[PDB]
């Protein structure tokens, strides 16, 4: 019934293309298209890991109590902004052992909703109500890179990189839940297969993107640097 333009750029046109690609369109159906899209995006971001949904940010360690941000889903490289240094993640028992038994390497763990560090780190960041003030990040400022949970659509004008990069993915993953809402199985299976194929293509692209500029050959690393 409804019309739509060639590019599905925004939520407003996606919620109409959904009803178009499925003639099952009416009052009792269009009102829940938002819920189907919500379920589809949740099913997507639950396991999708790609750059465009990443986010880098400084942390405040406070030697221990340091807390995990709300948007934490998976941690990428973690380091500082001074001469470079990469942390490695270990288990709580290793850190508890390091505490008593005893600074080039630095470890960390995940205690519930915290990030513990064996050394008494003193990373500094501006407080909450600070107005602007980039602060010219001081030293001992760790920078964390992780995968952040993207926002949920709340306005027809609201767009997202997924719409501009792969709208068919959302359209199929939401037609799945649509054909589930109504009684239909063939469409469910076909849309699920197509969405899974698109997601596989995207993750394979991400894979072929990483470490894709030259071959590798470990040069028999046996710690040439031992003197220190």
């Amino acid at each position: 019934m409804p019309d739509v333009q060639y590019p599905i750029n925004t939520y407003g046109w996606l919620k109409k293309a959904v009803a178009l690609w499925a003639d099952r369109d009416d009052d009792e159906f269009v009102n829940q298209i938002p819920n189907f899209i919500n379920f589809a995006e949740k099913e997507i971001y639950r396991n999708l890991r790609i750059p465009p949904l990443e986010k880098e940010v400084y942390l405040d360690i406070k030697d221990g109590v340091a807390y995990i941000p709300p948007d934490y889903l998976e941690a990428q490289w973690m380091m500082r902004a001074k001469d470079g240094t990469i942390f490695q993640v270990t288990s709580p028992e290793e850190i508890s052992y390091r505490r008593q038994h005893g600074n080039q390497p630095v470890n960390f763990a995940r205690f519930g909703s915290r990030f513990i560090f064996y050394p008494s780190i003193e990373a500094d960041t501006p407080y909450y109500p600070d107005d602007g003030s980039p602060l010219i990040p001081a030293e001992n400022s760790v920078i964390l890179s992780y995968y952040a949970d993207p926002p949920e659509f709340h306005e027809d004008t609201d767009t997202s990189t997924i719409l501009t990069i792969a709208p068919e993915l959302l359209l199929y993953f939401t037609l799945r839940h649509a054909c589930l809402f109504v009684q239909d199985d063939n469409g469910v299976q076909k849309w699920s297969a197509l969405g899974k194929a698109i997601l596989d293509e995207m993750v394979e692209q991400n894979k072929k993107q990483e470490y894709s500029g030259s071959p590798i050959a470990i040069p028999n690393n046996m710690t040439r640097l031992q003197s220190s």
């Binding site: 940010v57 405040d60 709300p70 952040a148 501009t164 792969a166």
Partner: peptide
């Protein structure tokens, strides 16, 4: 705009807000 390019943009997060513990501190 990007067609399939993943670096052509970066969708924001829910919100750059801390936990209640940081606000209390």
């Amino acid at each position: 705009v990007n067609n399939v390019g993943q670096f052509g943009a970066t969708e924001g997060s829910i919100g750059a807000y801390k936990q209640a513990a940081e606000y209390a501190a």
